[PDB]
Design an enzyme around this catalytic site. Sequence first.
Site, short mmCIF file in Angstrom:
data_model
loop_
_atom_site.label_atom_id
_atom_site.label_comp_id
_atom_site.label_asym_id
_atom_site.label_seq_id
_atom_site.Cartn_x
_atom_site.Cartn_y
_atom_site.Cartn_z
CD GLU A 83 78.20 -7.09 95.29
OE1 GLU A 83 78.66 -5.64 94.96
OE2 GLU A 83 77.21 -7.07 96.22
CG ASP A 125 77.20 0.93 96.87
OD1 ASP A 125 77.16 1.69 97.14
OD2 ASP A 125 77.18 0.21 98.00
#
EC number: 3.2.1.17
Length: 162
Positions: free
Chosen positions: A11, A20
């Site tokens: 991440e 994202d």
Amino acid sequence: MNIFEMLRIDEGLRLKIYKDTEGYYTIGIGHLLTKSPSLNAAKSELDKAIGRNCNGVITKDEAEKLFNQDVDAAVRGILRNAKLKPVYDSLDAVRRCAAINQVFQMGETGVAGFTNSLRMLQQKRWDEAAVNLAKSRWYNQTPNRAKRVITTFRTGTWDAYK
Ligand SMILES: O[C@H](CCCl)c1ccccc1
């Protein structure tokens, strides 16, 4: 290696609001803020999550606090899902991390189409499960990460995370 180190690799860590892989406003260690395209809505969600007016920026400690909460929430979720729980409980600790990782990324409703992979995992048909897992939007849209998670399911080792 452990679930925190694994998800930190997958991440990243960013202290300002970013989008994202799906284009959704996010912060910290993959903390999804909202699916709204409005940055102001994302900022409201951030302020609500942190408990102060952040103006789109947080500290490392704040990021890690959201991360602890988000990991905890991924696990607790899996355990409340009547389809996921028995498979999760059937797994060893390393493969359980693969499951947490995938749920963290996709959400529970996100893995609703994985019925056949789930069955193969419970059966411990590891190579077959790995093949089935890759027949997915998930793999096609994030192949490098999916390959790591799938290798973890296939082997029950941390080989993909060095
Ligand atoms: O990562 C996989 C996705 C469904 Cl085959 C998973 C397996 C077992 C429990 C929860 C999630």
